[PDB]
Ligand binder design. Structure first.
Ligand SMILES: CC[C@H](C)[C@H](NC(=O)[C@@]1(C)CCCN1C)C(=O)N(C)[C@H](C[C@@H](OC(C)=O)c1nc(C(=O)N[C@@H](Cc2ccc(N)cc2)C[C@H](C)C(=O)O)cs1)C(C)C
Ligand SMILES: Nc1nc2c(ncn2[C@@H]2O[C@H](COP(=O)(O)OP(=O)(O)OP(=O)(O)O)[C@@H](O)[C@H]2O)c(=O)[nH]1
Ligand SMILES: Nc1nc2c(ncn2[C@@H]2O[C@H](COP(=O)(O)OP(=O)(O)O)[C@@H](O)[C@H]2O)c(=O)[nH]1
Ligand SMILES: [Ca+2]
Ligand SMILES: [Mg+2]
Ligand SMILES: [Mg+2]
Ligand SMILES: [Mg+2]
Lengths: 440, 426, 67
């Protein structure tokens, strides 16, 4: 019961899925062939890891996942790679021609040809669930598949599944690793189309992850490999609540209840601690109080924005490892008396806490040090709207001169879809301003 | 995935022949058609430009066209003339005689369908065709008229494919031919409407680089073609080797073409070399933004950059490349359009070209390209006001109307490159 | 009370159905506007090209008119 299907869309979405699934296997004791000696219930069970892994009669633990890209080259590496025996061929879906960093191609042109095949395979996975909770969608904002195909898939999933949970891990564009000049158009187009069709979305600023790798892990020019290894850790922290069981374990839905005050205000800020190198972690252990305080450090955020210049609407602390309530309670009490967190006048100032005892695992040949305890904070701050504004400014500069718009118009889109998307973004920015005003 | 190469006329076939030698060398393919290389990366994306023939052989997906067998015979006789498919040499006996109307409407027209059949044979056996690339001249008659006739005939059968061209621009410093401005203006009028992306290879630039910079006493056509080949190898690197940025014709087009008509790129290369026997990341970075390294006789500082692509070849620090690319952008911010944020894209290939340890190719969509078109419109108006040499063209069937129309369209294109050079952010 | 309880669950169902319905409708509407638009774009492109072919006949006929 309570199964979750993961959907990995485009290169960003697929490569992050590779990292995530690689890490879940390591955390549950699942071998690259899908075998799990730790599991005595052969052919199936009701265990907490079963929300993410299906079981075959043979004893193979199969990810409840679909990988989609409009081109073969990225998924082909999964088919050939270490975990080729982990997935059934039918879970790995490729086209022949990609969306060429164009929303219109992924949503319409190219995407229309593969959509029903993707839905069939999602349906096949859905049919093996005794009690489907919902979906986890991994994609980039900037790519044509990542933006347009995700939009189309989201719309179709709302039609096919109703109001069954749809969560996203969206890669926010950064110049340092940016592939296209039209990423701000694709980001605004996907955000508009998907807004109504998502219940919660975790944005990951590639610049924020880039900076952490450079600063905390002392990596000169971070690769997507380095980036995905750090995202793997944040994703694992948010899904640990679902993949493990415990007395102090609070479900992702309970965090969501607190994180979403209004349907459109469903973008939580993720902050992870500790991100430390093996060299810097040798003979230095960080306490519950140390890792907790590090969450209120803008340097550890998944999105670059200032929550100290914004207002909180929630704080959730998701602990991993050697953590006891006494210490968490004391660390929270300290931050509170330290009065560093300004909250909206309309909501309770409590901190919702979950704890899983299984400590964070590390991928061999990693930059990350294995720590005894880790924390992920999910906060709903008005500061996340800074990300919306930066992306909205870039869009504005280009759309004023109608720069590159013909590439979209030539694929069947109208100028009207652009202006309508942008007006939704102005409305969302206004909504984030409104929630931050004190009541009269 | 697959690109179809088409070389038309003397200039086209000559520059196209060198392209095939150079990239074959790079991919480890000998003139027989076998792979005798070291790295696996040479083969990863070989299917882009080559056909995997029976008996582990690699055949250039190239179509050689000419209204006269002269040049094509020399190419067949050449060092690599044996790697080609014999059936892909499609040639006339008449010639165009540096007449656009002959290559376009009459002689080239009678030969065009025989070409289309080979173009189709190549396109049918493609797993997923990207588009096509044409090497030619605009000053001649065959590459100029037939090359532009082929562009429109192919577009009718593959409207959704990328049309890329390496258009060699006519200079008086290079040829005595008086009808070169007439042939170019009628060609550019075709290119504005029917190509997705055109690399503007100005002969004036190639000659001045040879004479002045390269210190060549008497520059030959093969000396000019060493610059063309270097340029052609750099601009296609990202298409031939595994990478992330501008890896296909359309991803490159989406990044470089903000407006449909403004698709004429100013290629640039560093280090500038000669086929004789003879640079740091900041030096490479600096050089490929200076007029002396421009393959089109245009000064970047006389216009603004709409978009730029920077290809880095060799083993260097990615961190350093990132820092140097950031340096030139901050230090030259005025020369970049503000209303197009993050318009400079940078790729890094570990495979350097032969004879170098590191190189930098620059692909720019600068409004300064209007200098190349203004020069051709001046060279045209000198003759057209006089109604000079028009019998060569009217005689083949054309009207005076066509030349007025072609002049206007190329004048409009310059008004447009200026329009966005003057365009404000606030 | 038993009436209002019945009314509330019915409103939950109708709002969910109306949502799936509107979504289905918006998508059908967008995929048809895009199909018509892309087709109209290729059509326009090929008439421009077909007129370039028509003009070439006018040129080849004008040449043969002198002989
Ligand atoms: C007096 C007329 C000469 C011929 C001509 N003069 C001029 O261009 C000027 C500027 C002089 C004043 C008026 N004006 C017409 C000229 O120098 N050129 C046309 C050369 C080209 C000419 O070189 C010389 C030194 O004359 C040629 N080079 C080749 C050549 O490279 N041959 C190579 C084979 C080839 C043949 C044709 C083509 N299109 C490409 C390649 C073979 C040799 C071994 C090599 O590669 O150098 C042939 S003619 C320049 C401007 C590019
Ligand atoms: N963090 C991270 N970002 C990635 C990765 N791959 C791509 N991106 C980012 O995603 C954006 C480009 O999107 P892609 O994932 O390559 O696009 P796509 O969905 O495959 O779309 P097309 O290839 O155009 O069909 C840029 O912002 C990249 O920096 C990855 O593995 N990790
Ligand atoms: N750079 C370069 N220019 C050339 C070459 N061959 C011819 N040209 C130029 O091409 C123009 C004439 O066109 P040409 O290709 O010879 O005629 P075509 O056979 O009718 O296409 C002139 O401006 C020549 O200088 C060559 O190999 N390299
Ligand atoms: Ca079991
Ligand atoms: Mg892709
Ligand atoms: Mg000639
Ligand atoms: Mg000539």
């Amino acid at each position: 019961m309570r199964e979750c299907i993961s959907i990995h869309v485009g290169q960003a979405g697929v490569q992050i899925g590779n990292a995530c699934w690689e890490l879940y296997c390591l955390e549950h004791g699942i071998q690259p062939d899908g075998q799990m000696p730790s599991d005595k219930t052969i052919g199936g069970g009701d265990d907490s890891f079963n929300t993410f892994f299906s079981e075959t009669g043979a004893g193979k633990h199969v990810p409840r996942a679909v990988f989609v890209d409009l081109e073969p080259t990225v998924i082909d590496e999964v088919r050939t790679g270490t975990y080729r025996q982990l997935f059934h061929p039918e879970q790995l879906i490729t086209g022949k021609e990609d969306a060429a960093n164009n929303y219109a191609r992924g949503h319409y042109t190219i995407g229309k040809e593969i959509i029903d095949l993707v839905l069939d395979r999602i349906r096949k996975l859905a049919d093996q669930c005794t009690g489907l909770q919902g979906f986890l969608v991994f994609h980039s904002f900037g790519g044509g598949t990542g933006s347009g195909f995700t939009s189309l898939l989201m719309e179709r999933l709302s039609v096919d599944y109703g109001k069954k949970s749809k969560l996203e891990f969206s890669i926010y564009p950064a110049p340092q690793v940016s592939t296209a000049v039209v990423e701000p158009y694709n980001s605004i187009l996907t955000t508009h189309t998907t807004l109504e069709h998502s219940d919660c979305a975790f944005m990951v600023d590639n610049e924020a992850i880039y900076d952490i790798c450079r600063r905390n892990l002392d990596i000169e020019r971070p690769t997507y490999t380095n980036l995905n290894r750090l995202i793997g850790q944040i994703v694992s922290s948010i899904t640990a609540s679902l993949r493990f069981d415990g007395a102090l374990n609070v479900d992702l839905t309970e965090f969501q209840t607190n994180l979403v005050p209004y349907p459109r205000i469903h973008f939580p800020l993720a902050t992870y601690a500790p991100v430390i190198s093996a060299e810097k972690a040798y003979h230095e252990q960080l306490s519950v109080a140390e890792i907790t305080n590090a969450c209120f450090e803008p340097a550890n955020q998944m999105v670059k924005c200032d929550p100290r210049h914004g207002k909180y609407m929630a704080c959730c602390l998701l602990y991993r490892g050697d953590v006891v309530p006494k210490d968490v309670n004391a660390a929270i009490a300290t931050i509170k008396t330290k009065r560093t967190i300004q909250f909206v006048d309309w909501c309770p100032t409590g901190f919702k806490v979950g704890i899983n005892y299984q400590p964070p695992t590390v991928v061999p040949g990693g930059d990350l040090a294995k720590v005894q305890r880790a924390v992920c904070m999910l906060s709903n701050t008005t500061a996340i709207a800074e990300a919306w504004a930066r992306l909205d400014h870039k869009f504005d500069l280009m759309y004023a001169k109608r720069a590159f718009v013909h590439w979209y118009v030539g694929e069947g889109m109208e100028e009207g879809e652009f202006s309508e998307a942008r007006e939704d973004m102005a409305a969302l920015e206004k909504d984030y301003e409104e929630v931050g005003v004190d009541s009269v | 995935r697959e690109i179809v190469h088409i070389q038309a006329g003397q200039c086209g076939n000559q520059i196209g022949a060198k392209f095939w030698e150079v990239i074959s060398d790079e991919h480890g393919i000998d003139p027989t058609g076998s792979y005798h290389g070291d790295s696996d990366l040479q083969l990863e994306r070989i299917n882009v430009y080559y056909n995997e023939a029976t008996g582990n052989k690699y055949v250039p997906r190239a179509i050689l066209v000419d209204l006269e067998p002269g040049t094509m015979d020399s190419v067949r006789s050449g060092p690599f003339g044996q790697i080609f498919r014999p059936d892909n040499f499609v040639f006339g006996q008449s010639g165009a005689g540096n007449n656009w109307a002959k290559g376009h409407y009459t002689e080239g027209a009678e030969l065009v369908d025989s070409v289309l059949d080979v173009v189709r044979k190549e396109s049918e056996s493609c797993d997923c065709l990207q588009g096509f690339q044409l090497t030619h001249s605009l000053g001649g008659g065959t590459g100029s008229g037939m090359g532009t006739l082929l562009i429109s005939k192919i577009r009718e059968e593959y409207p959704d494919r990328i049309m890329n061209t390496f258009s060699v621009m006519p200079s008086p410093k290079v040829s005595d031919t008086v009808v070169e401005p007439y042939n170019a203006t009628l060609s550019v009028h075709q290119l504005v409407e029917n190509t997705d992306e055109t690399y503007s290879i100005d002969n004036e630039a190639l000659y001045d680089i040879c004479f002045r910079t390269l210190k060549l006493t008497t520059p030959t056509y093969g000396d000019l073609n060493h610059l063309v080949s270097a340029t052609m190898s750099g601009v296609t690197t990202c298409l031939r080797f595994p990478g992330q940025l501008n890896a296909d014709l359309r991803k490159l087009a989406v990044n470089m073409v903000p407006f449909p008509r403004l698709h004429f790129f100013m290629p640039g290369f560093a280090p500038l070399t000669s086929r004789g026997s003879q640079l740091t990341v900041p030096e490479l970075t600096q050089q490929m933004f200076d007029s002396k390294n421009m393959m089109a006789a245009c000064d970047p500082r006389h216009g603004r950059y709409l978009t730029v692509a920077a290809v880095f070849r060799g083993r260097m620090s990615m961190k350093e490349v990132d820092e140097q690319m950031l340096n030139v952008q901050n230090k030259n911010s005025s020369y970049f359009v503000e209303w197009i944020p993050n318009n400079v894209k940078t790729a890094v290939c570990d495979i350097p070209p032969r004879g170098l340890k590191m190189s930098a190719t620059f692909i720019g969509n600068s409004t300064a390209i209007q200098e190349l078109f203004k020069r051709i419109s001046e060279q045209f108006t000198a003759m057209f006001r006089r109604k000079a040499f028009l019998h060569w063209y009217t005689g083949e069937g054309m009207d005076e109307m066509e030349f007025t129309e072609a002049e206007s369209n190329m004048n409009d294109l310059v008004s447009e490159y200026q329009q966005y050079q003057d365009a404000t952010a606030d | 009370k038993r009436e209002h309880e019945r009314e509330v669950i019915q409103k939950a169902i109708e709002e969910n159905n109306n949502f799936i319905k509107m979504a289905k409708e918006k998508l059908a509407q967008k995929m048809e506007s895009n199909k018509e638009n892309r087709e109209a774009h290729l059509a326009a492109m090929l008439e421009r090209l077909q007129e370039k072919d028509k003009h070439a006949e006018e040129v080849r006929k004008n040449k043969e008119l002198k002989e």
